[PDB]
Amino acid sequence: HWGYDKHNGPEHWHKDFPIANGERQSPVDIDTDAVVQDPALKPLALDYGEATSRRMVNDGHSFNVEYDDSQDKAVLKDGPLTGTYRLVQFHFHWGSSDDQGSEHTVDRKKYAAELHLVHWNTKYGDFGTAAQEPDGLAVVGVFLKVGDANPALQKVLDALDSIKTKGKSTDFPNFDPGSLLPNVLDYWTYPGSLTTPPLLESVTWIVLKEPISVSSQQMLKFRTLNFNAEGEPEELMLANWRPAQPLKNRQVRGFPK
Ligand SMILES: [Zn+2]
């Protein structure tokens, strides 16, 4: 088992998951001075118009909104990518107070939470196959910046009472993941990993420059979830972010700049 406390948190994961100290781990700090433009980069092409949400699940480390990835209803193309990537799920990371919780940082600045929209490359057939390949996954990272209430986010938060403990799920149809995107789609990109065990090095990271908003009040609702299953002792889901990992050999690129 793994988690986010002093003893089982990120600093210890390397013992059970050696790849934690590897060459393309995420998240990273994005130093905007070192960011470079690249004329090969394209605008991000998100097509979430037919996206079909199925359910919401507490997986014991976070909560996921699952999408129907059996066809091309919710696809991600272009940006830094070649091919088509299907949306399989999104989930969030957040911290114990509003001044922390994002996984990526910008010139060391942290936000209150971060949304990850996970996509797999269709040339690999399924998520499991895709997850093992360097070009297999694409994750769009969206910062949640504390400020005004976010009404799109509120629909997600209203279901959280129904999935308090590990393993619970609730049906969650009709949620549009495009409603949790900012209006401008400028992004930073770098080759990285999943930010949770097994920490697979299979992700092209697409971190959006513009955050979406969230209220302090709304942030308290994230923190009502439990890491523990029902019947075990309570362990509140107050914080589930991995800190910045060393950039090592990698280049962060920016679009449009
Ligand atoms: Zn994540």
Numbering used by the authors: 4 to 260
How do the authors describe this structure?
A well-studied carbonic anhydrase II was selected for rational design as it has efficient CO2 hydration activity and could be heterologously expressed in Escherichia coli. Thus, to better understand the key factors controlling halophilicity in enzymes and to develop a halotolerant biocatalyst for hypersaline conditions, we undertook rational enzyme design by selecting just one of several mechanisms present in halophilic enzymes: increasing the incidence of acidic residues on the enzyme surface. Herein, we describe for the first time the successful redesign of a mesohalophile enzyme to an extremely halotolerant orthologue, that is, one that is active at 3 M NaCl and above, by altering 18 surface residues. In contrast to suggestions that large differences in accessible solvent area, non-polar surface area or absence of large hydrophobic amino acids are the important features that allow halophilic enzymes to function optimally in high-salt environments, we have found that increasing the number and distribution of surface acidic groups alone is sufficient to impart this characteristic.
The conversion from mesohalophile to extreme halotolerant enzyme is conducted in stages to assess the effects of substitutions on overall protein stability and degree of halotolerance. Crystal structures of WT and engineered enzymes were obtained to confirm the presence of changed residues, that active site residue positioning was unaffected and also to compare the overall structural similarity of the designed proteins with that of WT. The structures of the four engineered enzymes superposed almost perfectly with the WT enzyme (maximum root mean square deviation (RMSD)=0.42 Å for M4) with no significant differences apparent in their secondary structures. Some of the orientations of other surface residues of M1–M4 were also altered compared with the WT, although none, with the exception of N62D, were in the vicinity of the active site. Up to 18 amino acid substitutions were made to the enzyme surface of bCAII, but this did not significantly alter the secondary structure, catalytic activity or stability of the designed enzymes, compared with WT, in the presence of added salts.
